Symmetry: C2
Subunit: 74 residues, 2 copies
């Protein structure tokens, strides 16, 4: 668009802590939710994915957005 | 290209409106300040998905985090 704020970035580091705190492997999450290898790699690189992917992860994990994503400074 | 096994939840932006209410901000002020397009802003009012880039811009302007503006709720 023409957004006047471009100084922050997504981080999925809370998702990985959640998995480690519940003794879940990342491959287990990918296969359970049905996320593509390509989209899953975006998570590992903190690249944007669709809210539909994030909703599916929230659904499987019984959690909410703030449990898996954080806005941090670039 | 995405065949997700879970499709039962939807985004809600109702926390965003609460935040504006708590800060005495109008929805129109938010849109102009952040520079969100009219069509994209309309998607917020309908709880339709928008890019994380738009939501990061809103977080930045409001000095808040994703959980302050979106919630995952049953369809």
């Amino acid at each position: 668009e023409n957004l006047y704020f471009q100084g922050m970035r997504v981080s999925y580091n809370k998702l990985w802590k959640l998995l480690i705190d519940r003794d879940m492997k990342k491959g287990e999450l990918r296969e359970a939710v049905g996320v593509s290898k390509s989209t899953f790699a975006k998570l590992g690189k903190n690249e944007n994915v669709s809210l539909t992917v994030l909703l599916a992860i929230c659904e499987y994990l019984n959690c909410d957005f703030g449990d898996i994503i954080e806005a941090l400074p670039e």
